[PDB]
Design a protein around this ligand. Structure first.
Ligand SMILES: Oc1cc(O)c(-c2[nH]ncc2N2CCNCC2)cc1Cl
Length: 208
């Protein structure tokens, strides 16, 4: 049913840093997530140039932003390449260990948390605004899985028989009580325009 894993130490330390460091410019989490979706979309596109059957699981390549004020969630959905169970456990397809080391050295040398995505671990910026993060993913080579973590040094993985998605990745941000501004249409639009203005795939902001 539900397997429980420990974060590697360097990632545990990364997440604590994200959670505990005073840092006002939290909005960058959205750019880091959209940028991950854009990379996964690039990968499926590239693979389909030589094998168009990789798109049998869906031809449209796009990103949906879905705010839900009742559940207090902001969900980012892409139809990118998705992740296998293995990628998920291996820090969501990141080089999180070396990238964390590089990020923490930069933070010495003068960097601030906004540059996180330069070290390949921009996912973890979700913890600027979310108390809990659920990642649902479907890669053509595997079943649908849900990854989940409220930080605290551990994460879980289970098969998801919730609502099949076809192919891609869904990041559900259960927002901290004081970060509900990221559910406001005006606010999301501003941020996307500010930081995600040239992404090569349509980004659709859902209405409530
Ligand atoms: O927010 C995401 C969105 C995604 O589409 C993915 C994903 N799906 N397939 C590969 C990936 N990535 C993109 C970022 N780099 C690791 C692997 C991962 C994450 Cl964490």
């Amino acid at each position: 049913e539900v397997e429980t894993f420990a974060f590697q130490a360097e990632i545990a330390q990364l997440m604590s840093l994200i959670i505990n460091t005073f840092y006002s410019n939290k909005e960058i989490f959205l750019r880091e997530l959209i940028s991950n979706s854009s990379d996964a979309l690039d990968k499926i596109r590239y693979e389909t140039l030589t094998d168009p059957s990789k798109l049998d699981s869906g031809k449209e390549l796009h990103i949906n932003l879905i705010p839900n004020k009742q559940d207090r969630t902001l969900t980012i959905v892409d139809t990118g390449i998705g992740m296998t169970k293995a990628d998920l456990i291996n820090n969501l397809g990141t080089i999180a260990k070396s990238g964390t080391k590089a990020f923490m050295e930069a933070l010495q040398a003068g960097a601030d948390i906004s540059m996180i995505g330069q070290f390949g671990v921009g996912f973890y910026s979700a913890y600027l605004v979310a108390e809990k993060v659920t990642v649902i993913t479907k890669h053509n080579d595997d079943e649908q899985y849900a990854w989940e973590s409220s930080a605290g040094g551990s994460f879980t993985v289970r098969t998801d028989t919730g609502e099949p998605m076809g192919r891609g990745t869904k990041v559900i941000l259960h927002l901290k009580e004081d970060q509900t501004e990221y559910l406001e249409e005006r606010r999301i639009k501003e941020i996307v325009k500010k930081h995600s203005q040239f992404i090569g795939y349509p980004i659709t902001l859902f209405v409530e």
